[PDB]
Design a protein around this ligand. Structure first.
Ligand SMILES: [Mg+2]
Length: 249
């Protein structure tokens, strides 16, 4: 048989591994992992042409359906990173928002050196960028969509790796990376005085995290779907999730 799980390209990175694992033990069921973004995934499931959707954000009021079931597969965290030389140890929500908006333009304003801030972001198509902006309220409504509201003087880089190298080489820069990509080349700072840790994400004391949700019709689903959903809830799956740097609720 065939199971189609659609949506989030953020979730698809780990789902590709989970699926290949489940296929080893169930060689006659192909799990098609379709990375089309959280919103297309929801639509595909509601049209009955996916069995499962995956998202990297909570559902809106309008997306919620009474017979749709949701569970949280994992949390994925973001770190704010500065150059090792930067004395700043913490930013609040309003400070970071203000910096990304271009309202706060010198580090002295947020307890640092007298030096112009270089704001660094990711490419337009980046999932990590979309979640950072959603978490920080850095989009704006324009007619029928959200548009990025980050000051267009921000510099764009195209990976975690390149973000860290940029930060590492520029005392003035601030940026964001997946929490798992943190290494000693950059200084990860607190957000609202909470350290960027697995434990703080799991307890929601650290705010900069996003859910990986799994959506399906628990009632009206066929057995192959129920069996894959069970596996996603199994220790064998969780072990894999954790080992790739995602965080158990
Ligand atoms: Mg806004």
């Amino acid at each position: 048989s065939e199971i189609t799980i659609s949506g989030s390209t953020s979730v698809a990175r780990i789902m590709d591994v989970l699926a290949e694992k489940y296929n080893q033990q169930h060689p006659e069921t192909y799990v098609a992992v379709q990375g089309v973004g959280s919103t297309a995934g929801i639509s595909l499931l509601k049209k009955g042409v996916a069995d499962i959707a995956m998202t990297s954000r909570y559902l809106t009021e309008s997306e919620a359906q009474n017979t749709l079931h949701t569970f949280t597969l994992a949390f994925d965290g973001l770190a704010i990173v500065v150059n090792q030389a930067n004395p700043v140890t913490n930013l609040t929500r309003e400070q970071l928002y203000g910096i990304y908006k271009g309202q706060i333009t010198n580090w002295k304003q947020v307890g640092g050196n007298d030096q112009k801030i270089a704001v660094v972001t990711r490419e337009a198509s980046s999932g990590t960028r979309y979640s950072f902006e959603s978490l920080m309220g850095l989009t704006k409504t324009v007619k029928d969509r959200e548009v990025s509201d980050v000051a267009p003087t921000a510099l764009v880089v195209n990976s975690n790796s390149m973000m860290k190298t940029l930060v590492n080489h520029n005392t003035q820069a601030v940026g964001f990376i997946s929490i798992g990509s943190v290494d000693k080349s950059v200084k990860a700072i607190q957000f609202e005085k909470a350290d960027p840790t697995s434990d703080n994400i799991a307890k929601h004391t650290y705010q900069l995290s996003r859910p990986f949700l799994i959506l399906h019709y628990s009632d009206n689903a066929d057995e192959q779907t129920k069996e894959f959903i069970a596996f996603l809830k199994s220790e064998s799956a969780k072990k894999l999730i954790v080992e790739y740097g995602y965080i158990m609720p």
